[PDB]
């Protein structure tokens, strides 16, 4: 009976959504107190926009029956199936819109326009995601007997559960959105002066991080797509994954004397675990250590280069989700077990088609967002006024009375 | 074997204790910090007393065999059965059992004496939740082969998981406690004056909203009975009524400009949640967006009215749990497959038993405690002292020296 | 088919996981703000560096073939198994290997360095957590055909889910580790004078304690062995032992009128968990209420006792997971149900076996740690500069810059 299955992706659907509790914390103790409502409030509104879209029409793009390829075409309204599998992984698939989404605000928090975000979240929920997520996985629904594959899928193109597809769009996005409205005012000065601007409350983001930490168990487990004994594994490079990310930055920051360690220990935990959500289900537990770390390592030089060329990035969204979400995808043919790549192709085979994925994820999901949020922000600025950035988001619209 | 189903039972049970969570938080960031650590207090000191209440006694007086219909009396000291299925259906109804009762404490806030809750959480859980429940549910022991029905669900009362039973009986106890204690100092002055009073930890307050919500699953979930192919549309329904709460509520606030906008949705998301408690199990994805929706909007002019009534509502328990109650159970004679009625039921019919539960549930659950505390208030003085209102219940009876 | 089980248990491996949240919030809001984001890199750190230790070796020392009968060598760098429970067993214990050491840095918070907490946690991650393990556990390895027991085992030696194996281990090197750094700078002066010194975020206190009682529930399930019809109980007797303890403890506050009950009421719920770990599934739900109950009590009375020795327990360790954990122990000799223990066993019998895991216990992880850490002590100062810890260990060690 078809049971069983069900019942692991409505509880792994349940973990997922323990995420966006997790992003909730992780951004706002990472922000000034001044800001820490209204990445409350972004938090909370970005999951119900998602939600709706994905419900409305996102699913029906994603996975609907391909019209050329390039995008579904029905199951708009999700309601009925006569697939016993379709409900809980519509549930699931639609915790995976709401978590690239939700993404984005903590690379453009303390002097983003929250109308500025939801729009920008709706660009995401809309159309970026939905259509990537059909060329990556448009035929890979949960107990079909007639799907078609999207044409990255089609060519070979691996991602277990969204290194690319989830955490690489947010992370492309949030590049974009960072470029546009620019830097925190004090945080570059000169030519090569950088401030830290440290957050208020860095406790709640070690919740965060273990509260995400949890939840991925949940994505990781929800994409495996059936169950046998080999579903243990996902949980144990999962964990590795983030355990190794965590250390080797710690290591890092012990030797460096690191400032601040605990937001770079943090944040190699989550890349980590951004970078085994590509292979989880096709290395060993020694590989997965071994991709996680570098994850880690990765992340920790990438916040590092950021700041050197002057992007402002609050939470490290680009170190964590873009640079391990890239490194996860492209590792994948490294380390993978060749039995799950298309029986045609070499480890150089699947690199180049990995790499394919990569770059076709950066020019839709940072190219087309760069255009259409910098004209958007010609007749609708998205950074906030200096006063309500100097007294915080918590007194801009929809806040309070200053 | 039994053995799915228990572990079904099992770990939706953990989810509803993730509730308790939810709520501490929710409360905890929704009042000033000066009162905190009472809500702290208030907080776990009710899911104690309410679990050994309903060890001990609760659960014999609401599912034990009915001693004239009002009343269960077997089952005191739950331990052993030979229902194999019992136990864990046991834990998941005691921790429903705390639900109801800690719903009270955030409508109360500020200014109730810490003793005075802990005995309106006895009246609470001795009394009024668990003989509601008996008329509502007393014959709906799962696994049970020889149960009776209570009165009202013999005349055909419809709750699926306690949009009455639950979030009904504890707004309607908590409406009688503001009425008794009053406004706090500083909320209304004049004729129309209303000043907001607003927590110091909001971003806690959206992490409780996160929690809820996952809690939610649990509680829908663990009330489905069985499993069946149609489980997952439980966890859809639930998924849709939260977000279509939230999202109607982010557009209303949008469209007035609302102050604090962020206490407005994360109320629309719960009010969502509790609207499709009572149907989660017998409406459309359409049908549960729309009783969300609705139930969300319900909120925010609920919210509004009160305080033109000049009744202090800390964190809205009335419009989420009482509106939204009222307006679920009802909503299920609308929208709901008629499969699910009666035989010998028209859509009035329904309507018309389920107004009949409703107005039962308030005589019984407001105008009973409100004629016992009040009672009560007269020899035991239930609000604090104008000091320790001032200085903040941190420094109440059991707290800090001040 | 082994599915149901390994899903059980990488959900309960979920569970567990929680409780690293539990414990970050439950420390860190335990102390006052200077030093919260220090305690919250320990919280991650620790748990990254324990995860890594018992995954390259801490799971062989523990549960490999037995050298001697002192501990196993062989299981190193976890992989591949021809066991198809084993992986799920093996990501389940390294959560508790997570668990048993992370619970000494609340007894040491706010004056020992963050590389000193470290060094502690690779002592017990490669030394004490898996040698005890394997002397009471360690042939209680999940689907194994040909296990061979400790020698504590092999005596009838009996710990379900670790009062002994992870709580007090965990309690016991607390209590040295909190002797040889000393008591914090103005908590103790004269000959008998007590200063209590509060957290600054005590609600997060009681969030910590929620999510840990969540994730006793994954602690204690996932423990269990296999699935039949009386797993449900050791739920409600994991309920019964957290609500009575913190009901007791409650009473006793009103009864004492004391001062900050809030942290002793969460204490108790926290020990009549502890207590319950040795004996959930041996009892009957009234032994568990006393057990709980009595473990509460006590953890209020050790609480003052420590005060009056001059042992400063910043989170109350000792009073929690020692003081409950040998009450758990022994208590399973008084009321666990006879059928449990080995065949030639009275409870008098079964009495002296609990109390010689007790005692070796204490020799092996109060002993050793006691004269290695005084050792470490002498080359690698413990216990942070008065200046570190007058400012805050926010400003220490990979904190801020003063
Ligand atoms: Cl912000
Ligand atoms: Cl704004
Ligand atoms: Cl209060
Ligand atoms: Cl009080
Ligand atoms: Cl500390
Ligand atoms: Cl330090
Ligand atoms: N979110
Ligand atoms: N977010
Ligand atoms: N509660
Ligand atoms: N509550
Ligand atoms: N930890
Ligand atoms: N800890």
């Not at 323990?18 to 000034?32: D, H, K, L, P, Y």
């Not at 999951?47 to 419900?55: M, P």
């Not at 880690?296 to 640079?323: M, N, Q, R, W, Y």
């Not at 087309?368 to 600025?381: D, E, F, H, K, Q």
Request: glycine share 12%; hydrophobic share 50%.
């Amino acid at each position: 009976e078809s049971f069983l299955l069900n019942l692991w992706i409505l509880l792994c659907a349940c973990l997922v959504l323990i995420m966006q509790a997790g992003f909730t914390c992780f951004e706002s103790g990472n922000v000034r107190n001044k800001n820490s409502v209204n990445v409350a409030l972004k938090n909370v509104s970005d999951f119900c926009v998602c939600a709706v879209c994905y419900w409305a029409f996102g699913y029906a793009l994603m996975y609907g029956n391909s019209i050329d390829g390039i995008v579904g075409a029905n199951g708009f309204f999700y309601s009925t199936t006569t697939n016993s599998h379709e409900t809980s992984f519509f549930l699931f698939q639609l915790m995976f819109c709401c978590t690239s989404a939700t993404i984005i605000s903590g690379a453009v928090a303390e002097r983003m326009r929250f109308t500025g975000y939801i729009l920008v979240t709706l660009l995401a929920a809309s159309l970026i995601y939905p259509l990537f997520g059909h060329w990556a996985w448009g035929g890979r629904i949960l107990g079909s007997e007639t799907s078609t594959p999207g044409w990255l899928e089609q060519l070979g193109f691996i991602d277990f559960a969204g290194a690319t597809v989830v955490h690489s769009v947010g992370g492309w996005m949030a590049l974009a959105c960072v470029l546009i409205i620019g830097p925190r005012l004090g945080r570059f000065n000169n030519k090569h002066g950088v401030n830290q601007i440290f957050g208020d409350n860095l406790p709640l983001t070690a919740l965060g991080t273990f509260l995400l930490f949890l939840g991925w168990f949940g994505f990781n487990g929800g994409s495996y797509g059936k169950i046998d004994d080999m579903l243990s594994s996902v949980f144990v490079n999962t964990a590795l994954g983030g355990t190794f990310g965590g250390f080797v930055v710690l290591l890092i920051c012990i030797w460096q004397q690191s400032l601040l360690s605990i937001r770079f220990v943090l944040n190699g935990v989550l890349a980590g675990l951004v970078a085994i959500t590509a292979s989880a289900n096709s290395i060993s537990s020694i590989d997965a250590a071994t991709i996680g770390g570098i994850s880690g390592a990765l992340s920790f030089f990438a916040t590092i280069l950021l700041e050197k060329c002057k992007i402002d990035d609050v939470v490290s969204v680009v170190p964590v989700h873009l640079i391990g979400g890239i490194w996860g995808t492209l590792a994948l043919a490294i380390f993978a077990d060749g039995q799950y790549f298309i029986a045609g192709n070499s480890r150089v085979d699947q690199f180049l088609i990995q790499l394919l994925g990569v770059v076709t994820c950066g020019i839709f999901a940072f190219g087309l967002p760069y255009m259409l949020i910098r004209l958007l922000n010609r007749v609708y600025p998205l950074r906030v006024s200096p006063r309500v950035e100097i007294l915080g988001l918590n007194f801009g619209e929809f806040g309070l009375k200053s």
